[PDB]
């Protein structure tokens, strides 16, 4: 069970969550162990949560390692399409490269475009919301990347972070 | 529940099995529906299957549309890796292009290089087995392609065909 | 022997038709039974249609699978050129990557460049009407794509959509 | 409603037909008046022909200009795949670059690799029968190309050649 | 003997001339034959023409098939250069693709970038004039393309159309 | 602090590749924590280590992360060249791409890499030794990759294996 | 090693003219440059950056003009692959153009690297932090030194200082 | 009027014209002036000669500068095809790159292939006969390259050289 | 031996680009013979020349042939960089591709090269000065190309023009 | 400068072992390397090659490890663009691998540059004639010197000698 804070959303949708706050949310998403089964569980957990909060809306979910090995992929409602896979690669590439969520990086972009800010092709990179690194307690560097696509940007980002914290907080057992 | 005919596996392993036989199995793997949910059901079904039959073998499972859109992906156990992804892409590519299992296609060709017989890169197309198209009842053209990787090629292929036909065989 | 609602064609040209209504029309373009023969019937059928409603106009008509395999291609009158082939590629490539027709996607774009909104090379992808997905009843995913080029963008779209829906009543 | 000389088809398969005789046959494949409508008539005509002489065989049939613009494409039966599209490309690309059919050029090659004799990427160019230039009376240079794929190489060639010559008598 | 209507040139220069006018001239440039010799005759004819009308202007003249095969090339005077070749390739490319003079195509589009209106590179396609297709009497599709370079674009185009029609106008 | 086992080096240097053993050696190389400081402490540790054992021979040490981010790079004497960069890159990519070390994978083949066995281009992927994955007690996937270049491939590998297991314990 | 806050602001304000920059830059050189020199140089810059910038992830690189990499390290957590891209893009500028990244950024002024200098922005950075290590007895650089993660002017000044400060041995 | 020495041919066709002899033929092909008109004249001269010696055989003739600017191109009998243009570029590239005729270089190849002898792609290069540099009295470096394609290799090479010497020897006026 | 004409340099350095004059200056640069020795004598001649006039400034001189074969290359002081290679390459390609010098062509444009005026990529082709075609009394096409880099573009061009006409006469 | 015909045959016969090669090679170095040094070196090698090889077109190149070209010339008529390709392909080997082209050719033995060393033959030559100019006071080369057109072993030996012979000034 995952609930999206609605005032945190819309305070995202309307901008003006400070970067240092965003980074604080992100750094809260970390896991103790990361196991092939962990990836499956978390992936399905997110899939269920998205189906719950957003019925009838198609969403693609991805968990991949920093080298690209894909562990989990699903599609939630089936209005999805190949373009989802492009967003997934594109957001994921940003998150893995810069070490922050792809929402955060869009925020640090503001206006001014990926090309002239970070000197990267925007066909390759995607500064919209859905990518969030899966952090590791004890590793200083991410286990993997979690990526959501097909909701409004702020939702993709908040679903990832929320699910990632909710999940991590059920290993309170 | 999916059990592999041990007879058929050893046959396949020895390349004992004629193309018209191959195609006949493959022509049997078909669904009347294929929704986004069918995808997820089918993928976890196989995931269970591979893990019951081959515990402690890391195996990669894909379901994609012919256009490349990935509906489902999973890893069956620890010790999977990149190059499971390459193999999945390379098998799938061969299967969707040629209209038969990547395994059938390896049966065809045998001992000639891919570059020689089909005029293809082989860094690009894989001719080992494990990629089985998902056929549609109402259409001459496949719904999707199911691709397994990480077992022996005859097993990646068998697991594919068996569980695909097993899954198809559950309906009311 | 099909008819284009002059009012509708106009309701498109001024972009007065909301997305959910475009999807309405589109979702209704689907067939039971897609085969090689349905492809050819549909193509001949649209060929004739366009020729009867647009007699001196050089139109290109294509039917292709989501993996790009081409079932049907023709030109209607004598003024077609290689550029049509590019338009068909570009239009079809959009319809398949995105859930919807190239016209629907043209609309979702507005005055922003494809590069800017959807982040694609516009040399690679078209946003102009005339590519329409052929839906499967009970599959969630399209059988194939239908693409028309050389009429006015709103006419390309509507001839495609009208033809599928009309062809769909070929039920005997 | 056309007929393949069983003896001739055999005289091809064993390569007993000298080049100048292949050119003989070929030089005789030509039309007065090439239009959009002749393209479609020729394509439908060959479609029917192949279907009547090869009923369960999945054949792809193409007509394209020398600049690549495609006038006609179809598949005959239900087993065609993207690989056919590649064969058509590759066969057609040879016929156009070189003065002659892809079969004629296959013959001129023998056991040498295309890379070795003609110095081309065989992934790019086919030497297998089934691409035949549509000649112009009084032009020195072909109207367009005709390509057939999916029969046996010698059958692909001969159906194309037989069809052009036979179609050519459509004179009224 | 080829004289340019000085009226028509100044018109063209001022973009005074409607597309249907343009196409009408262009539709008139056609041969009943086009042999290898026709090519050489036509090319030297133009070569003479450009050099009588524009002495001491270096001008490049091409005749190629739509497939890229060069039948004829010459340089009319000293001070020609590479980039005459680029211009020739770029004009020819536009013309063969779009089915009209490279000049017509520049009339169409005017003030929009090529990338904007036709979705093309423009390092690749040129929209200045001077490339005129050579039409065939018996065919909807062009024999070849004639391309001139090194004058004012309206002249490269005019010289092209005039001498093409003049040449066509000599027969017994 | 870390010492080679010349006997095992012998077994490596010819035939004893049983791969259960090579795997068992590799699964044995892991850290409980991985930090920026950890990567510098280890890279330094291995520098000193090869400078003791192989005093006069130029050798390159690198630790990077599965996504290619390079945390540490050094070299132990003059006469190292750009070709070391290519070796590191090349054998790292192998180790990162397959589940295993380079040299485990080299052992797993007596054939052409460029499309006999694994269908990858040899120019891109190196099947000699020197790349070893740093593992994670808590994860079934690796922290980073350690790669050494410029000794014999067996020695490149063993130093990597030995120094990792060493650094781990003490 | 500590950065002169006046200089650093002068850099930031872009009131330090090219000849001065050149002068500071021309001043960074060595008598010996060896495999060990490089280590000595690299480490020494590392704790320096740790000292002056305790919270900040920073990647430090010493490479030869042919690309062969002698030293690489990161000073703290929070480093990413984009650091590597900056090291490449800044260093490429210095080795190609004969001055520091910072220098060329000044010389660039408001214009785009494509329009001035005619190069790809994606491939060539002008932010400073790359500073050519120089040789006495030679007209041409030993190697390049590159620092990234400190924003712009302190990337450059930390580099230049610790080169001079190392050069007095 | 150009006559192909038949014993020189066939002593070409069968190999065993020494390289140093070939080079001697080649160095005989040079011009005093090279003018746009010269290119046209020589190009047509060759075209006529080929039509004479080889009626009914299609041959493509090319004269280009070392930077690639094409001055003359024709096609003799019209059985020609695009593949001619490929041979023309390919042979021409060899001649211009190595400074000898493309026949000579095929001879210096012998067996053993362009790839492992000269480290060049043979799709790009073409060590068959028809390319011959147009030399300059006083320039030490070629005016241009002359290229013939579509006869037997030795013929392409001998037609070029013969025509190039015949032509140069009519400026004996 | 060769001296600049600071007055013409003035006319160049701003407005006097009439192009008939620039062409007339260029047609004037030719040699009656061109040899391997000629190319070395000239390259040396120009080295000395700029070392006199512009004593302390780094400058690169190159003569190559229309097909890109490089006969002579030098540089006149320290502080020349790889970027000089790119300039030489870039402005040579322009001069070799169009009928004219770079700077004649630069004058012929107040617009974007990369596809406003000439449709070529600026990264590939340089429209500043310093490239001048060496001509041939006997041919309507050029022997080779002379290109100088590292002064102001006007000076790069004039040195090239002046030294060529000089070398020609004496 | 004149080539020892015994040595040259030893090179040709491939009886000179790597450590020896290294030794000759390690022996070629300089105290100063400047823009003028490079000219002095380059010209000096040119007449040398003219002397020992009066009929033979030969291209001589001095380049920095980043590719920046200080000296280029040809010694006679009969040069071609393929000389330039050899200069590139040989020099690329030397700068990448830390030894001479000739050296690496020996170390290559009968195997293909693809199968040993894992590189493109089209991009990397092993024929010798490229010889790294070395620095005293440094572990890493000043620049590369490359000679082409003399076949194989005399390309290499002319290079090595005239480096040593120049190094005694």
From Swiss-Prot, chains G, J:
Q: Name one GO biological process term.
A: post-translational protein targeting to endoplasmic reticulum membrane
Keyword Cytoplasm on entry: yes
Coiled-coil stretches, from where to where? none
What are the GO cellular component annotations? cytoplasm; cytosol; TRC complex
Q: Where in the cell is it found?
A: Cytoplasm
Alphabetical keyword list: Cytoplasm
| Extra information | Present with 1200 molecules/cell in log phase SD medium.
Q: Which family does it belong to?
A: Belongs to the UPF0303 family.
Protein name according to UniProt: UPF0303 protein YBR137W
């Amino acid at each position: 069970m995952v609930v999206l804070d609605k005032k945190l959303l819309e305070r995202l949708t309307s901008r003006k969550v400070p970067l240092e706050e965003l980074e604080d949310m992100e750094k809260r998403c970390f896991l103790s162990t990361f196991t092939y089964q962990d990836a499956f569980d978390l992936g399905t957990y997110i899939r269920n949560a998205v189906k719950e909060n957003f019925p009838e809306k198609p969403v693609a979910i991805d968990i991949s390692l920093p080298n690209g090995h894909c562990l989990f992929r699903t599609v939630t409602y089936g209005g999805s399409a190949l373009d989802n896979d492009f967003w997934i690669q594109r957001k994921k590439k940003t998150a893995l490269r810069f070490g922050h969520s792809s929402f955060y990086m869009g925020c640090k972009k503001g206006d001014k475009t990926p090309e002239e800010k970070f000197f990267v092709d925007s066909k390759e990179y995607a500064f919209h919301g859905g990518a969030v690194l899966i952090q590791s307690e004890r590793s200083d560097y991410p286990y993997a990347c979690l990526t959501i696509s097909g909701l409004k940007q702020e939702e993709d980002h908040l679903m990832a972070v929320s699910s990632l914290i909710a999940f991590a907080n059920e290993s309170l057992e």
